[PDB]
Design a protein around this ligand. Sequence first.
Ligand SMILES: [Ca+2]
Ligand SMILES: [Ca+2]
Ligand SMILES: [Ca+2]
Ligand SMILES: [Ca+2]
Ligand SMILES: [Ca+2]
Ligand SMILES: [Ca+2]
Lengths: 242, 242
Amino acid sequence: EPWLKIGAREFRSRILVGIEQYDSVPLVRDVLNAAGADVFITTVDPDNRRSSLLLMDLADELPLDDFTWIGTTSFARTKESALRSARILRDSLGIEILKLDVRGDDNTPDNAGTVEAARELRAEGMELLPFILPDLATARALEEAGCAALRVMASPVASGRGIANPAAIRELIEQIGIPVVVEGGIGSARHVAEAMELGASATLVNTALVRAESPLLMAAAMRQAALAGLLSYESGPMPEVA
Amino acid sequence: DEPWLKIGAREFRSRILVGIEQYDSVPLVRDVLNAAGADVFITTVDPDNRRSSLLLMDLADELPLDDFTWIGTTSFARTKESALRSARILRDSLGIEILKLDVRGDDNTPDNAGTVEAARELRAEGMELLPFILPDLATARALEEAGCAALRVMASPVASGRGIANPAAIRELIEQIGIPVVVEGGIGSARHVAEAMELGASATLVNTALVRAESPLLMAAAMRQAALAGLLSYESGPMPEV
Ligand SMILES: [Ca+2]
Ligand SMILES: [Ca+2]
Ligand SMILES: [Ca+2]
Ligand SMILES: [Ca+2]
Ligand SMILES: [Ca+2]
Ligand SMILES: [Ca+2]
C-alpha cells in the first residue's frame, strides 16, 4: 500500500535517497536500486541555475515511470532563495512536487521561514514536503496550509547521531494527520528501524549512504530495517518500548 | 547465511535465538520459531517425564525439529549446584552436550563469579557452553579462556523491554573477546535487535518481547528482518557518530 499519494503519483518505498549531491549516473542507479527507492530528487542553485541530475539523465539506466520526480530547494539559506529555486524547477522542468528546504546558519531548518515559503508556494499550487525541527505549532500550520507530508529533523545533518528526541517525534506523529518522514542525522539501519517504530511513514537518508564503506550494502540494510521497523510497529510492542 | 558459530557438525546461522523454555503453548512455540527463522531449539525435554514428552511429541509433527540444533538449559535451576546437576543429567539422559548456562542471583541477574565457576567445572567434562553474564571484561576473558563457545551478555534487565542500557560497554567487550557474543535480556522490539548487531553482536536472544507483543508472530518476523538489516549495516561500515 502507498503511504502517500499526490495526484496520480504513489509513494511506496519507505526509504528516500537524497541524490542531489551525486554526479555519477551509474552510482545514482545503483544506490536507488539498492534502497528500493521510487522517488528521484533534483535540485537547482538559483544564483547560477546549475542543476543536479535530471530524471531523464537516467533514462537508459532506470525504469523512469516507476520513479516520482520531485524537486528540492537545497541551496536556500533564505525564504527568497527557496522560492526562486522552486519556481525555476516548476517552469523549466515541469516539477510540481517539492522537497522544501529553508536552512539557517548552522544547516538546521528555519521553521518560520519554511512556513512563510510554504504558504507562498501553496498559493501557486505546488505540492509540498517541508523540513522542520520537531515543533507542534509549526507542523499543524504546515498541515493546515495543505502540505502533502512533513519531514522532521531527527538530529543535525551529517552527524549520524540518529534520533535525538524520540518522544517529541512520536507526539508530533500522533497529532499530525499527514505522513511524517524522519530525516537528518540518520547514520545507520538501526536509526531507520527506530523511526518506523515511532510511527514514521518513511525515512530520508543522504550522508549515511555516501560515508558508509560500502554504500550499496548500507542502502539495502536501510531498506530492510524500514520493513523491520514497520512490522515491529504493527506488531504492537510491549508497552515499555514506548 | 554464514554460520556465526559451529560446534562439532552443528552450525548456528539464524541471528535470532528464541528463549522458549518457559512457553507451554505448542502453537506459540511453532509460530514463533517459524517466523523468527530460528535454527536453535532450546529444550527441557525429559524422556521419562510425561508432560514434557507429550509437549515435545505435540511440537514434533508441526515443526521440523531435525532442522534445529538442540541445546539444553539450566535457567530453571536457582543455585550453582542445581545448574551443574541439570547439565550432567541433560548430557547423560539426552546425550546433549551444548548448554545454555544460566546461574542467577535472586534478583534474576546473572551471577558472574558463580557462572565462571560453573563454566570451568562443566568445561573440564567437555560440555560446550553458552553462559550469560553482566557485561564485565574480566569475566568475559575468563570465560573465553575456559573455552566457552559463545557469550550471552545482558543488555538490560530481564522482561524489562528497556533495550541496550550500556552499548559502549558491550561494544568494547565484543572488540576484546574472541568468541561470538549474543546480546540478551530486556530486548523490547526490532530496533534493539538492529542495535545489537551494529555493536558487533553475532546474534540476539529474545523472549519477553515476543510473548508480550500484541502479535508475537509479527514481532518475531520483524526481529528476523532487523537482525539481518543490522548485520548488513554493521558489515557496510557505518559512518562514525559526530
Ligand atoms: Ca556532487
Ligand atoms: Ca554536481
Ligand atoms: Ca499521524
Ligand atoms: Ca526425569
Ligand atoms: Ca501436534
Ligand atoms: Ca575464537
